[PDB]
Amino acid sequence: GVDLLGFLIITLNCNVTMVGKLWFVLTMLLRMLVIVLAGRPVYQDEQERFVCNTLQPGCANVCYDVFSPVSHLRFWLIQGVCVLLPSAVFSVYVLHRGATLAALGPGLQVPDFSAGYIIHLLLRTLLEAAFGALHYFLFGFLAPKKFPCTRPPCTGVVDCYVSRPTEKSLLMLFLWAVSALSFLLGLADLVCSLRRRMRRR
Amino acid sequence: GVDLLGFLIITLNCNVTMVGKLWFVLTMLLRMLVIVLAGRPVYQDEQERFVCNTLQPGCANVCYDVFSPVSHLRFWLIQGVCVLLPSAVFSVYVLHRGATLAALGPGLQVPDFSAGYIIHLLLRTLLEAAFGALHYFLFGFLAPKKFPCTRPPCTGVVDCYVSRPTEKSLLMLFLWAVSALSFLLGLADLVCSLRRRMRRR
Amino acid sequence: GVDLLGFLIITLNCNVTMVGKLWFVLTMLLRMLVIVLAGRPVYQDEQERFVCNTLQPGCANVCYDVFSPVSHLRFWLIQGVCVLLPSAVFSVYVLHRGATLAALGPGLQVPDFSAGYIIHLLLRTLLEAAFGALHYFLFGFLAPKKFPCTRPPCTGVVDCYVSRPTEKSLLMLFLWAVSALSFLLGLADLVCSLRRRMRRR
Amino acid sequence: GVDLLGFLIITLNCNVTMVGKLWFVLTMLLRMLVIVLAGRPVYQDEQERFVCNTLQPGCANVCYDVFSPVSHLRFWLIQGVCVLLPSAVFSVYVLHRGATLAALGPGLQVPDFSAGYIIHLLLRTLLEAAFGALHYFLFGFLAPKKFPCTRPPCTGVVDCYVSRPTEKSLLMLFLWAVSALSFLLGLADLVCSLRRRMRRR
Amino acid sequence: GVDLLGFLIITLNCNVTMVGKLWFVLTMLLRMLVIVLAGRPVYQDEQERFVCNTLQPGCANVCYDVFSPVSHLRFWLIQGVCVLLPSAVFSVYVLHRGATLAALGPGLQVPDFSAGYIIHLLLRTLLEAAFGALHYFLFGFLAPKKFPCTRPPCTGVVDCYVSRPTEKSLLMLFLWAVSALSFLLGLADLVCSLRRRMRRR
Amino acid sequence: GVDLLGFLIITLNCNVTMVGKLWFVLTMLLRMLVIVLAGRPVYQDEQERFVCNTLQPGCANVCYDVFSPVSHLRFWLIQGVCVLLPSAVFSVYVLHRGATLAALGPGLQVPDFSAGYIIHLLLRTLLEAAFGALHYFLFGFLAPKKFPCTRPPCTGVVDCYVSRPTEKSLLMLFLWAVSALSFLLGLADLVCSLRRRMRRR
Amino acid sequence: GVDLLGFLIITLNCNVTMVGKLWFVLTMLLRMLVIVLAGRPVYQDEQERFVCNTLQPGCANVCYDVFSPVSHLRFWLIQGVCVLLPSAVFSVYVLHRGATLAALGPGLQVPDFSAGYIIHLLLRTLLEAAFGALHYFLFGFLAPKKFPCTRPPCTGVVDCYVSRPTEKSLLMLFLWAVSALSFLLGLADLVCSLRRRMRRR
Amino acid sequence: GVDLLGFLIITLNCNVTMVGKLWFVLTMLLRMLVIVLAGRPVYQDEQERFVCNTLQPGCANVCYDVFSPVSHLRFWLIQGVCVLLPSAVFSVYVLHRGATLAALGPGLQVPDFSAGYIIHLLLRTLLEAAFGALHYFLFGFLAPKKFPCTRPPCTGVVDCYVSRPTEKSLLMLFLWAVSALSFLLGLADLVCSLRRRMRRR
Amino acid sequence: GVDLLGFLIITLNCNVTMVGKLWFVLTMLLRMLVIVLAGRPVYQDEQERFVCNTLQPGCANVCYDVFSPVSHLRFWLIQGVCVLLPSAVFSVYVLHRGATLAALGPGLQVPDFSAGYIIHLLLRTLLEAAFGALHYFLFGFLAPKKFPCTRPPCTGVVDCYVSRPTEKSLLMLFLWAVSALSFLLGLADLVCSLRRRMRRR
Amino acid sequence: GVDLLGFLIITLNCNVTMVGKLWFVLTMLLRMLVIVLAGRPVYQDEQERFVCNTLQPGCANVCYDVFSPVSHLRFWLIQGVCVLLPSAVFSVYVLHRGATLAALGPGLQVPDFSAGYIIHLLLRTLLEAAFGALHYFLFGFLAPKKFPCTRPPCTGVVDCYVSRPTEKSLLMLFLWAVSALSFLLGLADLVCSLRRRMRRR
């Protein structure tokens, strides 16, 4: 005998473990917040000071074009949105299937949404290692300090200087560390959740 | 016997299919979020480095003016707001017609708002293909790398260089792909919803 | 016999017509959202490239000062905040007068807040035409392409070039069109609401 | 016999007058919104175009350093946060003391939080006049147009030009006017509230 | 006999003291708001005007690289997120343990979450002094005005000028003061909370 | 049981709203008083100093005759008397119908004179806009400074000078403003009075 | 059982019809007020600018003396005072005969003063047509523009110019119209009052 | 048993005859009103156009000084105030002696103030004939048209012309007639009042 | 047992003697009325005809400026307002103290306001002799007929003529006489009132 | 048990202090009376004798136009009407709220209108200092004696003379003094009235 703003969140909380909520909090507070708030200003001047010894117009632009095909800030943001998408689609799924059964009607009668959470965590584990592999094969571990440029709309080889490398290396090391921690915690979620459901058998 | 914060969301959820909620989630998380967050910084320096071989003041500005009449970032934002508007007007419609009947009063009595959802999806299908056609006829598929400029407040023809083309081409390809996916999913919504309502006949 | 999170929104919805909610949605989604999101980036480089033929320092700054006394972006924002203020003051008024009567207590007993909505719409109609007249008398319809400058801290007359005019003209035409549509819809609201209240007599 | 999401807002609304809510609305809609949204873009180019007649590097920077010790945008923001802080601390106080008494339990029994609101308004009146006095003694009424610079890391006296003064003067006049209106309205709140409580005696 | 949107916030408010809520308000209104809103614009031009007497390209960039290894804005943001993280993890913990017991069911029966709040405050006290020590040992109290640069990709020693130091010194003094106040208030919370729980013995 | 100098003014006050009395006060203190007291002396010397270059007698008189057909002072006075007439005729009506019923005789028995007040306000609203339109089409907004005169009892074209124009323009602007304020307030009276009488139904 | 400030005005109002009060209001507000307030200033400069071609002193004065024997302003004022005199003498009569009977003393006992009101209206009708006839035979309908003067203290015939004729013609037309309206209304009063007294027979 | 705003006017009306009230009305409506309203404007230009054949400065002023020692307008006003003074002093006397006896207290008990009214009328009759005699001996019956001037600050005899004589003669004839009528009516008052008081003997 | 429009004027009349009322009547009818009505027109042409033998512009104006520093008309008006002010302040005092005691409530109970009337008459006697002394020392008894002028913006000594002196001398003699009569009567009031109050002892 | 012409003025007198009535008397007798009666005649000839050395027609008029933009007589009158307006609006307010409660009915029951009088005096204090500041910044303390004129419709610089300056300076000094006295007395009213109402607490 509860209102449906009542038996609508227990059907949400009971199907998710506290480790999952902790994962959500860590990946929204230290992962979704640092990138927009600190990564946005640092990478604005990646264009302004790609300064290096040439004089004919149009060498520096092609030098940076061959230098940075894809900035890793966009990589981080797309990785973040894809690693947050399934938690939203599952949220919509569970709210949709919880708000519908109460309309028909009949010490609670909480439904058991266990089949989708394990496949959810499987998709989580699969969607992190691959993007980590792409990060490792594309951007490495530490950013270069200088770059030789040879594709000529300009005469000769131009030795061209990046702007502010140490900040970038430290910040991306921090992102690597937090991503590694999240990966292990996510692996812990599934391996604990599967055991805590066959124990009833 | 439920509160009106009760029989106010089932009258919302029951008239919309889970495919529609999934559409909403995908077009707000991968479509409304990427554009503001990643498209805003990339296109700030479309003006700073339209660099090219001229010396008299006032050639580069007219060269860009003849180069880019309308930036496609504004096109994407206006397309996004117009493709999100009907879902808001229908939301207001259904809340208005659900919160009013409960005032008069008389195992639920959920109203059937099916006539408006099919015309809603018709408007959705009509409002996407046209803007896609304008995108195709105006901005093409890949951005040029260099541009010849001839309208003289300046002497001669000026070969003028864009800034950072590959990032733009990849990003707009991603937008094209997500828009194509959303179009097919939206076509699926109406064609399934119409069948699931004549089946009762 | 409803909770006071119950008989608190019907006393809000019943005193406002669906045309009013549609007005609110259109003026927050296509009017409050486009200006902050697309008008902010376009007008950052109104200062950087006011480029024109002079060499002594301090001519370009006074030339722009005599050029643009007030930027119309600030005009649009102040117009938006003033055209959204009365809907907030009325909202606070109606919530205050609805949450107070329920404390004393005694098939609903919804109060009739009709006197304030008609004067609300009168204030709406009065607060739009005047600012439209100021817009017409101050900023015209299309932005100039070049400007002659004569006030001397610099020698001679300087012919000075604006940056990116066509984008500005198209965007402000779009704002003019949406404002005109909102004006007519707002005029429709009052003229329909007054009739729908004397019909009971 | 009401839920505690019930007797939790009347204990909030009944202890505050409609003039106070109107004050809150005016100081968040015309005061907190204009500053972030219009004051942020105008003052970005206060650094870019502090242009003036010198050639040795490092004169303009010290000239601006002696020119503007503290920008008044930061002054406005700190003033805004301090003039909004007490309304938040009182809000937390009243919610804390309202949500606690209902736990013990026993035509309502609304508590009377009148002692704190009068001291609240006293603190309000005291925290505005002082900062107004600092504003008057530090930033004056109208911004200069040109500035003489003498502290030498550079040779001679440099006559140095500000950027866009009239916009700044008009905007800060608008802030002065709205602050003056808020001050008088806040003085009205306390002087009316004290009378409306001794009238019961 | 209350709804579970009822006995869900008293189980939140009763386990936290009003001093804690005041701490939350002060550290989100004067600490989380000033940094994003005033610290973001001031530190954008820390790169643009690191101006100083050299002519060969690539001396200024390495001079700033040896000048500022880590900007203290990022230090402040990471400190803020780490000093707000435990209050979020505890919030999730208490909501999770409060929303679960109500499902089973049986003048209230509020649980006593006192063990976690004291260890929470211990972690708070430990996570502030260390970062304060790092701040003191890394960034000092006042920012320099000029800097000698010697690491050669450039010929000689370059005396290089910072931009806008007094604003930075005053602002970081304000942050130091508010952090010191928060530290003392947080120390007060634990020392009062421990006493107010052994008094029942 | 009251004297008839008693139940003779409540039958007057009860049928008129406080907004109406405020209208009466504003239009007699700032409208009937300024015109007689300040407009009478200013316009005496509109004849004495219509001075201009001619020598044959009888050119200046015909020049002013073609210059000013009707002085706007008389227009203002006739407008004032016509906008005060209905309030006098209604006053006489209500006193006549109140002093007569008491002669016959039978916690008061105040009559309801509501039908005449609404038609009174209708006549008010109709009798202001028309005269405003005549004012706009006849006297414009600002008075000329000089006038060419051609109708010959005199030789040639005579350029003829008005006396004291700025005082006249400012004063008539003040009258325009007060008339505009009175118009809006009068429109408010009827629209509020009609609502406050159907609310009883 | 009423005070004598009571049964002293009903004995005044009951013997006069509402048409009579309306006549009084119209002839004091549009007839007694316009003449003193607008007719006084216009006719001050009827003497100053009776300008015309002569040079020997003392021709213009005799020319005006033969021009205007009696100014029609004095005619209007004497007509007004004579058309207001009987209403005052009757007022004094009725107050005198009402305040005297109450001294002796004995659902009212209002006296019937009907014989004097009909003779009053007869005197009214007789005292208007005659003065209208004198106005028509003396001052005509429109004022001349120029006047020939022949009575010699001066040599020759002098063609002499009036000042401001159109204002005078329009104003006296307005007086003619209001007088005509008052005449018809006064004729209506008697013809209705005589019928409404023989109807009782 | 009447209020003292009751037995305060019958003690005023009963001691004065209707002929006296008629005298008051005629001498305030046709005597006090014509002089201020029509005599004030006519006599303003008695100074401006005392025009006559002389050229040396200062002859015309002495010519008028010997012409008009005292203007008869001031004579009329002083005569009016002296002929209205006793009616005011008697009014104050009777109100003072009527408002005092009622304080002590005891089908009315009206006092008999007959002794003062007869001496009042005696003073009236005495204060009119003398001033009439002065008028006759000083100002005659008709005003001259021209005047010879001989007292030399100027050379010769100057024949000097008055302005507008016929208006003055007609107006002062009207005053003479009304004064003569008032004199006879006042003589009638006393001779009737004395008889109507010895008839009781 | 009287109404409060009853025991409100006896408390006014009983505290003032008939000599005082006679003083009020004489000083308002022969003193306040003559000055506004006859002194206003006579002194308008004190400026127009200050005619005298000079030709260079700007001698006559300075000659009158040295002639009349202060016109005695303004002196008379300020003297009148100051000699009428205390009678108004005492009137307000006595009405205020009479209308207040009746609110509380308990062959009359008239209060005795004798202390203020004697000090009132003392202030009267003191405020007349001083202004009479200033009149005597400033304006003398008879006005000059001609004036020598020497302060040069003009060449030589100019013998300059006043306008209409005899009227002024006679009129100001009349004012002197009436003021002298009022002074003696006012001295009589106090000396009689003090005796008529110690006689009760 | 009093008539309603009874309990209608005590509800007026009791809510206003004797200092307020004294203020009303002083500002209507020495402030409203001097300006109309003495300021009207003095400033009529501000136009007639603006005499100065020029001969071409149309120089003097423009010279005065640049001389006096706004005459301070109109400033004084508008200041007077605005400083008398609130006392009228409050009067109407209190009579309206006093005459209405008596209709319903139930050693008096006088209402307490204290809240409006303090805000009334606040508005009084605010509406005087500002207009005093405008007076000080616009018209100064003493009027000039001569004025140089340069705006050419006339040849050269014209030294132009005012008329009667010392009278103007003395009179406006008197107005300044009386305004200063009224300001201090009004400040006394509020500061005494606020104390005399918290003394009851």
UniProtKB/Swiss-Prot annotation, chains A, B, C, D, E, F, G, H, I, J:
Belongs to the connexin family. Delta-type subfamily. A connexon is composed of a hexamer of connexins. Keywords: Cell junction, Cell membrane, Gap junction, Membrane, Transmembrane, Transmembrane helix. Expressed in pancreas, kidney, skeletal muscle, liver, placenta, and heart. The chain holds residues 3 to 227 of 370 of the full protein. The chain crosses the membrane at residues 18-38, 75-95, 121-141, 171-191. One of its GO terms (cellular component) is connexin complex. It comes from the Eukaryota. Its main location: membrane. One gap junction consists of a cluster of closely packed pairs of transmembrane channels, the connexons, through which materials of low MW diffuse from one cell to a neighboring cell. It comes from Homo sapiens. Residues 1-17 are cytoplasmic. It is a multi-pass membrane protein. It is found in: Cell membrane; Cell junction, Gap junction. This is Gap junction delta-4 protein. Residues 39-74, 142-170 are extracellular. GO terms for molecular function: gap junction channel activity. GO terms for biological process: cell-cell signaling; regulation of satellite cell activation involved in skeletal muscle regeneration.
